[PDB]
Design a protein around this ligand. Sequence first.
Ligand SMILES: Cc1nc2ccc(S(=O)(=O)N3CCC(CCNCc4ccc(-c5ccccc5)c(Cl)c4)CC3)cc2s1
Length: 329
Amino acid sequence: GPVPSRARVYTDVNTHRPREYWDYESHVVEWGNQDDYQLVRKLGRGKYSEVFEAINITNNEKVVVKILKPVKKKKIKREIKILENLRGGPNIITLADIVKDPVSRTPALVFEHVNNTDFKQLYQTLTDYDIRFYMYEILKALDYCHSMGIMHRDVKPHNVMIDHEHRKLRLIDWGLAEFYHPGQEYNVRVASRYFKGPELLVDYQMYDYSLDMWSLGCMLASMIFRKEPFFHGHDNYDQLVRIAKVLGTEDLYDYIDKYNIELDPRFNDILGRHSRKRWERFVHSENQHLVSPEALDFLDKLLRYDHQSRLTAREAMEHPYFYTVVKDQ
Ligand SMILES: Cc1nc2ccc(S(=O)(=O)N3CCC(CCNCc4ccc(-c5ccccc5)c(Cl)c4)CC3)cc2s1
């Protein structure tokens, strides 16, 4: 069978906490009063939930309500527990309240209100510095949640809110996040195709925080190269093919050998033989202002098949790409 793996960092953080910290099935949800919030307008619809702007009539504060679609109670408890554990952490969305409709029995998460700058506006105007700054802010949230024993497992642009006017950022949608325990086999059917790590695609279940670092690398690539999505797979199999056409097949097969991974016979037809490509082939006159030796070195050190060889969040934060942003703090 496959060779086991443990996180290189924050390995045992949960083992040292009281069981209640991570044993979310035991968590009893503290309900607030639904009548405290009036819905104002729909903001979005999102697979597991519908999102509204609302107002707390107790105090006239603007709030955001996520009305959950039917999910298992255990997965709701998981998300709530994680949100509560991470509350106060840098750039983590703040859960303000939890309410249920007395009639429809539907449950609703109440968050802090954060405005999002118009995507068209923001993207038009970004700048190399801005990307470094916001990437650093995301890394602060990931180092924090990893240090708290939690993997996000769905890092991607949709789950990053920015308010450019106030230089503010939040990592949202903790609904797929899970506690890391050494030895645990996790579900590989998580995260969106374009952001799935090789570990998920080859069905290596004993993964860890480092999954998030792959996803982050995918985000960085899409931003500096102005290509979304960067790895555009047609399905889960082709997703790995797209990766292999860039990172090359030699290192992929080395990874599968090292962990004694058994590959679906299908991959053995489609994967073929691919050299490792240089990042320069994605650079053009439109994106060159975003692309630097530092950016490429950083990218290279996130996008690695072997989850153990990817940068940690804290290592990433020390990378030369961020020197000027850190100097500003
Ligand atoms: C508690 C909660 N409150 C709200 C409030 C509104 C909503 S929403 O459903 O209406 N909607 C979700 C989708 C957002 C778009 C995500 N931004 C993309 C982005 C992300 C990152 C970047 C980026 C990345 C790296 C460097 C620089 C910028 C860049 Cl360039 C762009 C808008 C808002 C849900 C929640 S959940």
